[PDB]
Amino acid sequence: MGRVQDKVVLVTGGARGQGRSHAVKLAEEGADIILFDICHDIETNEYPLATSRDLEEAGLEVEKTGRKAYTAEVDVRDRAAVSRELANAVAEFGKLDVVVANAGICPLGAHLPVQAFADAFDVDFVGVINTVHAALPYLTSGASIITTGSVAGLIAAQGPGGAGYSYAKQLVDSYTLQLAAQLAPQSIRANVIHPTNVNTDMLNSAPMYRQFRPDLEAPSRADALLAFPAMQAMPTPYVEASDISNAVCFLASDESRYVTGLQFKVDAGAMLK
Amino acid sequence: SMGRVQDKVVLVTGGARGQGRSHAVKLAEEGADIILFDICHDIETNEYPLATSRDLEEAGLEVEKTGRKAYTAEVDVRDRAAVSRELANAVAEFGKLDVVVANAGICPLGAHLPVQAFADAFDVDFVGVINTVHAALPYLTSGASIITTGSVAGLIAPQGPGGAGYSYAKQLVDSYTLQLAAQLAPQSIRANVIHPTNVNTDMLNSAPMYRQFRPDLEAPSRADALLAFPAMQAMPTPYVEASDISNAVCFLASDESRYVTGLQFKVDAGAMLKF
Amino acid sequence: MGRVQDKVVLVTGGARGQGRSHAVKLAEEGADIILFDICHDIETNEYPLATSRDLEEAGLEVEKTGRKAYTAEVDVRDRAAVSRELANAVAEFGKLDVVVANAGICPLGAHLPVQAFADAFDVDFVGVINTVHAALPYLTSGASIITTGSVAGLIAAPQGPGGAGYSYAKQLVDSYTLQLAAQLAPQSIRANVIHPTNVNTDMLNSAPMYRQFRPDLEAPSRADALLAFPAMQAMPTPYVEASDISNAVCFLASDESRYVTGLQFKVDAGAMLKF
Amino acid sequence: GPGSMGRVQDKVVLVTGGARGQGRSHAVKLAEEGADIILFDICHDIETNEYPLATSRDLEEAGLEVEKTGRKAYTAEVDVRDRAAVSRELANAVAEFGKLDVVVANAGICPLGAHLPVQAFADAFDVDFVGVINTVHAALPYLTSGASIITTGSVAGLIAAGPGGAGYSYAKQLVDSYTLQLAAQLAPQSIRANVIHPTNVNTDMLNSAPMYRQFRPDLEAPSRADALLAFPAMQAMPTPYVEASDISNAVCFLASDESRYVTGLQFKVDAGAMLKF
Amino acid sequence: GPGSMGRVQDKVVLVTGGARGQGRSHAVKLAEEGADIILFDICHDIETNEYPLATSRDLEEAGLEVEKTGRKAYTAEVDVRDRAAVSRELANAVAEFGKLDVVVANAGICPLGAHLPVQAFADAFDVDFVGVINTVHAALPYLTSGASIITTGSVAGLIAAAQPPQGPGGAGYSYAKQLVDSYTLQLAAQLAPQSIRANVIHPTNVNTDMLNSAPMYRQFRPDLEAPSRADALLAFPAMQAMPTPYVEASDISNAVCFLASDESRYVTGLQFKVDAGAMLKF
Amino acid sequence: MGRVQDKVVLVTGGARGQGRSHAVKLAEEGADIILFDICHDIETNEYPLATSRDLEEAGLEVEKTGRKAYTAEVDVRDRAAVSRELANAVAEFGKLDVVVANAGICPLGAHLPVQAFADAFDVDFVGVINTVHAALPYLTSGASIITTGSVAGLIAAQGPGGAGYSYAKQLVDSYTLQLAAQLAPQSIRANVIHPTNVNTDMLNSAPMYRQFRPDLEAPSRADALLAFPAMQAMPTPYVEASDISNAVCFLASDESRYVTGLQFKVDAGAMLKF
Ligand SMILES: NC(=O)c1ccc[n+]([C@@H]2O[C@H](COP(=O)([O-])OP(=O)(O)OC[C@H]3O[C@@H](n4cnc5c(N)ncnc54)[C@H](O)[C@@H]3O)[C@@H](O)[C@H]2O)c1
Ligand SMILES: NC(=O)c1ccc[n+]([C@@H]2O[C@H](COP(=O)([O-])OP(=O)(O)OC[C@H]3O[C@@H](n4cnc5c(N)ncnc54)[C@H](O)[C@@H]3O)[C@@H](O)[C@H]2O)c1
Ligand SMILES: NC(=O)c1ccc[n+]([C@@H]2O[C@H](COP(=O)([O-])OP(=O)(O)OC[C@H]3O[C@@H](n4cnc5c(N)ncnc54)[C@H](O)[C@@H]3O)[C@@H](O)[C@H]2O)c1
Ligand SMILES: NC(=O)c1ccc[n+]([C@@H]2O[C@H](COP(=O)([O-])OP(=O)(O)OC[C@H]3O[C@@H](n4cnc5c(N)ncnc54)[C@H](O)[C@@H]3O)[C@@H](O)[C@H]2O)c1
Ligand SMILES: NC(=O)c1ccc[n+]([C@@H]2O[C@H](COP(=O)([O-])OP(=O)(O)OC[C@H]3O[C@@H](n4cnc5c(N)ncnc54)[C@H](O)[C@@H]3O)[C@@H](O)[C@H]2O)c1
Ligand SMILES: NC(=O)c1ccc[n+]([C@@H]2O[C@H](COP(=O)([O-])OP(=O)(O)OC[C@H]3O[C@@H](n4cnc5c(N)ncnc54)[C@H](O)[C@@H]3O)[C@@H](O)[C@H]2O)c1
């Protein structure tokens, strides 16, 4: 008897990092997962995104719990693709209970053109809209929508991609609260998780290193690692994907049936600074 | 098969009934030994009954039924010295203290009540929280979790002096918890505040609360108030249940929430979205 | 000679109303125009959108000035389509200087489902994003991006989910436009948002809008609504005319505003002065 | 040319500080667009303002620059701090031109410098806010439905939300809030009021020893080439300033029936300045 | 009395609007505490302000009441709207007393009424904000280290800020009183280096001819077409948190005396509410 | 007849510093005074607090004016003790007119444990609550409650103790205005005085010197004096206790009968630096 027993969960960006961690955690707690991921790079985003193989490994990891996995290569900027693959996924499972709008990029770097802003926004905000809007027809009383924000985003309230990332995340937050209001009469909840630094390929990337160590020409991971902890008030350079998955599991579960419009910081006190 | 608070020691003030009892039992089910403090007598300005001695005994027995230990004591959180004394005794018995649930509270509503109602709501609902937290501090070590009970209706601000005192105390419980979270973060001790909307307990289900929800009748019954309760929430419900708050408490008390601190944890069925 | 001599201007929602008025004014001032419009209805929006005929007539009115018009039936919710048609128009006109993201719906009604919120948002915000993001590759030094907000939307910061979606979309058009102005400023490209009050077009003169303005009546006529329209303005008028917005569009599109960027350009007859 | 119909055709416009800089620029642009201009300027220095103000010849030449467009000009040396003089000279100008349509309350000083006494606060405030009040309150009895009042604020002023610099910013902050109060009061009569907030403008005010010293506090006493290196920091667009003509284009829009329903607008011409604040 | 040492002993105080009301009260209080007084008042009506202002006699009687304390009084009929006249008479007054220590910029009108034209906005603003400016600025070159500038605000004025009838004059009054407040703090910051103080006093309802006026009764009883004083007196107390319809001029003079006195030598930029708790309702 | 003629005033922290200055000023103006002070040190507060002798001498100073003094050793953290001694004092003096909740500590130091936060808070906020709540049953129309804030506190909105101090002082402010609202119908007033730096033992202390000169390891007074003036807009390193007592006297006197809910800065313009 798991904490999300027999629920069906959509996870965007589910191939690796937080998304894969959420898929596995929820499956461990008794849910079947629909995993969507781009599975190829975006040009202005100067670290590798997930591969086809990552998404496969992610399905396998889920299946290993005894739950079922639907996998699809889908770009969240493509609504029709999201709609299409979601109908397929529902066909297999018959239901959709939880939406985890987790996919995102962080195309940082001051030398990048304004396209990087557009790309950060298209994926990080518009892709979230596309995800929820595609998912709404399928949701009934008791459904839970979970969106991924960013503490660094809220603080901003790095170049064109950084700016677009921050502003997209501020809108993920305010949009989530609008959605919460709109869906509350139907007992469908919507909440935003705001992580601080998370130990994933997004954080452990060359553009992110240069962001934390602007004093250095070519900072290494070891150099950035010295600057990582300043973001948190607790003594840690980052939280783990598991820390985010714990909050996702709480919000996915009927345990949180009356939690909606919550700005759920998993930040090690970053916002207390 | 480990519990979510496996072998932790938790203090719960106001543990005799309502949310506090629900928190005790929930955390005991999840593998924690529980220290329950409750005043077990009424407060004059507060015009509905508080917990009785039989309540506290029954709370302790319900915890013991899970196979965990319960330490129960009649303690008024307005009494710093008595809080520290009993807690010393309980920590000595249980070995350690991992979690603090500063839940005890009163809601002394009524337009007719004197200023004492302000001072009483403030003394219990804020000063009592401070006294609970400060008495606990010397025992807490890295990974400890402090959980305070706020109130959405609080944050949103005929209620009288007791209602003004209630609202202001709850506002300060919120700013205080966040201030404490900043000071405790370098030691990896967390502090977070839960803000319930309406909760189905003796505090909500009380004559002064019914007068507050129905300012248009002079002696409204529960049936009259129950018609007005839903206005508070955005989701179609008159209140949430004690189990809903316990679920938030369990999450914050568990190592699942090791990097969650300074959070204003609304369990409010959308109440704050109407503001 | 003209105030936008030889410029090329994309106008979305160009078939009628403010959009067509912008096209014609800008053509009269020396610019060639690309006019996009959906030319069909949207189910949650309970008034008719422009027709194929409206769009052809708008193109003709542009050409009447002696300048060139490129028309295309295009849903701003479809970015592929916006990009495809803009490509065709640019290969014909050789250039793109000014973007007027004017297309919008106002799907009011207290009886409408949450779909109405998504449709308002998809068109009014995502449609603006799609428009601008499609235009971005083509812009050079001195380019001008003009978006259309709404005073009533700002103020929002019964109308039903559609009204909520509308208001929120317009708030985001505003904050998005300023963020984009910041990012484009290094290349001397500007972005400004125009916030009209009531404008005398089919959006304002529509059955859902009459009900919005007369919630005291079950079945208000235009005449009943026209009595309420002036309350929105501080000046004694029921609305501004499309020509008033077009005058502001022409300033922003002209080289005369080369250093005007990040401006929230109210043409509201004092509507915001009522806070 | 002869018989052109302009954007401000046949209007009568009052422009304070119309002797040089933005004021002269507005006077000319509005003349080119068909308006007859009443120009007011103090035409002497102010002791706390440590750069020279306009001269009598400057004003005359502003009148001449106007007539060169084909339009009529009325000039008077008037200190906006003297409401009686404002009233007396305006009443002369209206009886002779027969009407008043537009008010450009542009007169201003910027008496910067850390060493100056508090009088520099009083002088900045008396000219830049009281003189604006003096201008408007004097002109009001003449205005009817369709008139347009246009006050000059300042982005640097808004952002700030020595003693002369403190008085300048605060005065500009009040120009802004006062213009919006006035717009609300005059809306029922269909009279409009709006404020233009320039960033750096290439004028004698920006090109002054006090300003250079303010932009470059690092040099003990700097020059124009020095300042011109630190002017750009103020704008988001890659420029050290806007020109007087950029402001005159906004003025022309607000003076014109084109902007008949535009009121209470905080009209930034700032090259993106405010997007850094 | 004369032979002993008062709280403003041997100071010289300018009070504008000194002919009656709070101004006359301030003058007499300060003189009992050892100060000589310069009393300025307009001593004639303003047309948009639909209640009588002070009379020439009022001003004479105020000087005499100052003199009855044993101190010296200097009176002049001055419109605070005319800076040239403020500066001219202030020079004459200072030349006669030799010094200026305290400025109390108290002169004001409240030209309320729905029916009045926009001139009532301009008149409220010219008297209540521009008059205060002309008062302070005319005084500045006479002030040395230790001087104290005291401006009269208004709680009702401030409350109106937070708030989104009173007519053009009412709007000009509230906006003017909001500017008195922000202006006094700006001035306080600019004068602090010279050890010159500036503070603003914000009264709630005060029992004077301004409060006891036909336009004020319409303001307090908008439900009545022609409310009397008795009608208005039922609504007056709603402004205060303490149970009273108004404070007295003496209450305001007590705060003026504190601020004028060397007792408050390090008090500056203070927003000094004397409001019986009015601001606790907003 | 003095400005507080025949009133009975309770002053907490009355042994020395501002509290003793308030006592003697009010006594000179005709009031009998009740003086409470802890009269021993608090471990996390690394400068000496008042002694038994300070308190007794403070009472003698009051008596010298011809008025009566009642002194008691009382830790304002102990409400039971505050109530008991106050019942004793009121029994003797017959009534209670004015409460001046002045007792405080400032336990600064970056090295100190979180206990210093709790101690600063227990004394400087809960201590004030205890004082006011213990006095409420004695108060009638015209009574005046005067709490002591801190400009440095308001600006903050140093170590755990510093943070505890600033936060406590911020709540003294908001609490005092709540109390004013609640007591207004009884015509009982409550006002908060916010001082800037005051020339007392709290300011003239090694932890305060380290606070104003974080760039040094053992700052002397001379080192700290170079930095004290930056806090004020007027050219002074601090105000004196007498400046604060002057404000206390105004608020204690019937002269301020209608002043309530006031945040009374005596800050030499500190807050004008925002
Ligand atoms: N890592 C951090 O420090 C941090 C902090 C705050 C928030 N976040 C957010 O958490 C979320 C998860 O990121 P992560 O930390 O797991 O990094 P990650 O890069 O490992 O995971 C992001 C995943 O989303 C996928 N993705 C990217 N663009 C997509 C698109 N258009 N369509 C479909 N899938 C796409 C990627 O392939 C990748 O698998 C993101 O929204 C990110 O912005 C991360
Ligand atoms: N019930 C609601 O609608 C609601 C909403 C928001 C917040 N809250 C808060 O939740 C908390 C729990 O209240 P509840 O709903 O369980 O009601 P409850 O009255 O059933 O529980 C409160 C308990 O605290 C005890 N208590 C009260 N004063 C005490 C004191 N001085 N010392 C020790 N124990 C004391 C009572 O005896 C009782 O057992 C309170 O802080 C309350 O303010 C309640
Ligand atoms: N009329 C008002 O009172 C008012 C007030 C404030 C703001 N606005 C805004 O002004 C803008 C113009 O509207 P209007 O007043 O001219 O009304 P309108 O309905 O006459 O014009 C809207 C035009 O946009 C077109 N359109 C709608 N959805 C589209 C889509 N998805 N793709 C392409 N075209 C689409 C319509 O067919 C129509 O031609 C809108 O953005 C509106 O929100 C209007
Ligand atoms: N130049 C800038 O960078 C800048 C930036 C923002 C705002 N402004 C504002 O723009 C306005 C125009 O100034 P400018 O840039 O043209 O500089 P300027 O010094 O060339 O023009 C100011 C003109 O006003 C006149 N003047 C000054 N005091 C007067 C008085 N008391 N009475 C009558 N006339 C008086 C001067 O003689 C001068 O001709 C001013 O209000 C100024 O504060 C200027
Ligand atoms: N009465 C209240 O309820 C109240 C409340 C808040 C603030 N105030 C303020 O207190 C101040 C004094 O008013 P009061 O209550 O004593 O009323 P009041 O009308 O009795 O006194 C105002 C005095 O100022 C004089 N005066 C008016 N305009 C003048 C001018 N232009 N030049 C010189 N003198 C002028 C009047 O003749 C009169 O003597 C005013 O600033 C007022 O706005 C009054
Ligand atoms: N000195 C400053 O710079 C300054 C600035 C702002 C505010 N304040 C406030 O002024 C007030 C008085 O301080 P001061 O400057 O006279 O310093 P001080 O240390 O000389 O005096 C404080 C007095 O309170 C007493 N006291 C401390 N804890 C007590 C307790 N628990 N119970 C009873 N008495 C206790 C002390 O023994 C001492 O006599 C304090 O609230 C302080 O925080 C001081």
Numbering used by the authors:
A (entry chain D): 1 to 157, 167 to 282
B (entry chain C): 0 to 156, 166 to 283
C (entry chain E): 1 to 157, 166 to 283
D (entry chain F): -3 to 157, 168 to 283
E (entry chain A): -3 to 160, 166 to 283
F (entry chain B): 1 to 157, 167 to 283
Provide excerpts from the study:
Here we present a series of TIGR03971 SDR crystal structures from several mycobacterial species which contain an insertion in the primary sequence at the NAD cofactor binding site. These crystal structures demonstrate that the inserted protein residues almost completely cover the NAD cofactor, only leaving part of the nicotinamide ring exposed to solvent. Experimental results are consistent with the notion that the SDR family enzymes linked by comparative genomics studies to mycofactocin do indeed keep their NAD tightly bound beneath a protein structure that may interact with a specialized adaptor machinery for redox exchange.
With the exception of the M. thermoresistibile target which did not contain NAD, all other mycobacterial SDR target crystal structures contained NAD, which appears to have co-purified with the protein after expression in E. coli. For each of these crystal structures, the adenosine mononucleotide portion of the cofactor binding site is enveloped by the inserted residues and only a portion of the nicotinamide ring appears open to solvent (see representative examples in Fig. 2A and B). In addition to the insertion loop which covers the adenosine portion of the cofactor, a second loop which typically contains two α-helices covers much of nicotinamide mononucleotide portion of the cofactor. The combination of the insertion loop which covers the adenosine portion of the cofactor and the ordering of the second loop which covers the nicotinamide mononucleotide portion of the cofactor results in a significant decrease in the solvent accessible surface area of the cofactor in the mycobacterial SDRs, relative to other NAD- and NADP-dependent dehydrogenases. Given the encapsulation of the NAD cofactor by the two loops in mycobacterial SDRs, a large conformational change would be required to release the NADH cofactor after a redox reaction had occurred.
